Amino acid sequence: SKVALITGITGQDGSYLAEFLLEKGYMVYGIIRRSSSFNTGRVEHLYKDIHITKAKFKLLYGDLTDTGNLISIIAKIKPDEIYNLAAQSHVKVSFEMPEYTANVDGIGTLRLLEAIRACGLEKKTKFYQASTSELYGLVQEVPQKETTPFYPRSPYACAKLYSYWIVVNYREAYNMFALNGILFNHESIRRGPTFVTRKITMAVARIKLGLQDCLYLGNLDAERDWGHAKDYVEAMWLMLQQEQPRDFCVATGEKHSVREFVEKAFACIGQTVEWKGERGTVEEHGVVDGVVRVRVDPRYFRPTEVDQLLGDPTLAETVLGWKRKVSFEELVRGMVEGDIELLQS
Numbered sequence: 442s443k444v445a446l447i448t449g450i451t452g453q454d455g456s457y458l459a460e461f462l463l464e465k466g467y468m469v470y471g472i473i474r475r476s477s478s479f480n481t482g483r484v485e486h487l488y489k490d491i492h493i494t495k496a497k498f499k500l501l502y503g504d505l506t507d508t509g510n511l512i513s514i515i516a517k518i519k520p521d522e523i524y525n526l527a528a529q530s531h532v533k534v535s536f537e538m539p540e541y542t543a544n545v546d547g548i549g550t551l552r553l554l555e556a557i558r559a560c561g562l563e564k565k566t567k568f569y570q571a572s573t574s575e576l577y578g579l580v581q582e583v584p585q586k587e588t589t590p591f592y593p594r595s596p597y598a599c600a601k602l603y604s605y606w607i608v609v610n611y612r613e614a615y616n617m618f619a620l621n622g623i624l625f626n627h628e629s630i631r632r633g634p635t636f637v638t639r640k641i642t643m644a645v646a647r648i649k650l651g652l653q654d655c656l657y658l659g660n661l662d663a664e665r666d667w668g669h670a671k672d673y674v675e676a677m678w679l680m681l682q683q684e685q686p687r688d689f690c691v692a693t694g695e696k697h698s699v700r701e702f703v704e705k706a707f708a709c710i711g712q713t714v715e716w717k718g719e720r721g722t723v724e725e726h727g728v729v730d731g732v733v734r735v736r737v738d739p740r741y742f743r744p745t746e747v748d749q750l751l752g753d754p755t756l757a758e759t760v761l762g763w764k765r766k767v768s769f770e771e772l773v774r775g776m777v778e779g780d781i782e783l784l785q786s
């Protein structure tokens with residue numbers, strides 16, 4: 442049985458990827474940060490009754506800023522595949538801690554690549570890097586594809602850009618099987634609560650149950666290609682099963698605005714948003730049956746916004762056989778219903 446190592450296994454994608462690989466019969470190791478409290482909620486069902494289910498699943502303490510810990514882990518488990526999903530993954534937060542973001546999301550990638558070399562595993566271990574459509578930033582073409590030049594617009598995107606290219610360089614310098622999944626935005630009921638989609642659906646669920654009065658957002662006009670994270674982790678695995686390492690965009694090929702996300706989320710609870718005030722300004726607000734339910738707060742703006750992302754996944758469809766399954770309609774409805782069920786649980 443193959444051995445997979447997942448960094449960031451406690452995050453949204455890592456939790457779905459772990460399920461995917463366990464079902465394929467992998468032995469799955471995950472690196473978890475030490476936390477002062479419980480922080481494994483997304484994977485707790487995978488180890489809950491580990492003593493009876495005998496699942497090939499094991500969690501280990503580590504951190505992407507501690508090079509020696511990474512090498513110690515990799516030298517002992519000698520994985521067939523590493524998926525580097527660990528990151529300070531939030532764009533807005535990256536403006537507040539750009540250095541930590543660079544150290545985790547940039548140099549952390551290199552630490553793992555160097556760990557492979559230091560263990561002499563170049564012929565054994567494949568490496569997936571969690572790259573991102575954020576690299577396109579101020580997009581230089583529409584749609585964006587594997588050949589679209591990058592224009593990062595946050596310290597997160599800059600750090601992820603270092604990682605994209607250090608992966609390419611180790612692939613080309615050392616003939617390592619290392620590649621970049623250029624994934625566009627993907628969400629789920631497991632999305633972190635301060636990303637815009639999950640923030641919308643948690644707020645709408647609370648508004649339905651009368652536990653919240655108003656939702657405060659930033660830029661309503663940002664447009665994103667939005668898929669379901671569960672669809673996207675399989676693309677990660679599929680890149681590693683290719684004969685030759687190559688970088689792939691993964692996307693739905695359609696985009697929607699934050700505003701439309703808001704509208705669709707409220708429609709799932711039978712409510713209609715009417716926008717009032719100068720459209721696109723901080724005076725704009727969303728009305729439901731006369732009551733202000735959405736407001737704009739400049740604190741959620743980013744200093745350099747990424748206005749619109751639209752992926753062309755043609756290469757992934759034809760080379761990997763991958764295509765999104767969850768539609769945008771289904772994505773929104775699944776998250777709103779999930780978040781209502783969570784409140785009533």
Ligand SMILES: NC(=O)c1ccc[n+]([C@@H]2O[C@H](COP(=O)([O-])OP(=O)(O)OC[C@H]3O[C@@H](n4cnc5c(N)ncnc54)[C@H](OP(=O)(O)O)[C@@H]3O)[C@@H](O)[C@H]2O)c1
Pocket residue numbers: 448449450451452453454455472473474476480503504505506525526527528529530531545571572573574624625626627628633
């Ligand atoms: N979601 C998207 O739309 C999207 C699109 C393209 C690329 N990406 C990238 O894909 C990856 C997975 O995304 P995601 O949404 O699942 O992110 P996420 O939910 O925020 O998960 C990030 C993971 O990294 C861990 N981590 C953070 N800093 C760490 C450190 N110093 N050492 C070790 N582990 C650390 C986190 O641990 P804790 O639980 O302790 O915080 C968490 O398990 C990230 O690299 C992200 O930047 C995401």
Ligand SMILES: Nc1nc2c(ncn2[C@@H]2O[C@H](COP(=O)(O)OP(=O)(O)O)[C@@H](O)[C@H]2O)c(=O)[nH]1
Pocket residue numbers: 530531532533575626635636637638640657658659660661663664665699741742743746747
């Ligand atoms: N996180 C967040 N994003 C918002 C909000 N209002 C608008 N946005 C926009 O939604 C887009 C998606 O942001 P986000 O969900 O954090 O994922 P990102 O693509 O990695 O930045 C960005 O253009 C944000 O500026 C908000 O209240 N929170």
Ligand SMILES: [Cl-]
Pocket residue numbers: 488498499500
């Ligand atoms: Cl464990």
